Amino acid sequence: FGGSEDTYPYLTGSWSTKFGYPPMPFDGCMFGSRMMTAKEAHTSKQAKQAIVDAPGVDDDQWENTYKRPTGGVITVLSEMGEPIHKLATRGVLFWKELDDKIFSLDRSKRVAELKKRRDYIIKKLNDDFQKVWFGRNSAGEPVDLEDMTYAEV
Amino acid sequence: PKYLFATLDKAQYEAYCVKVQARQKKAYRFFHNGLINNKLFVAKDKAP
Question: A83-87 and A73-77 as β-strands: parallel, antiparallel, unpaired?
Answer without folding.
Answer: antiparallel
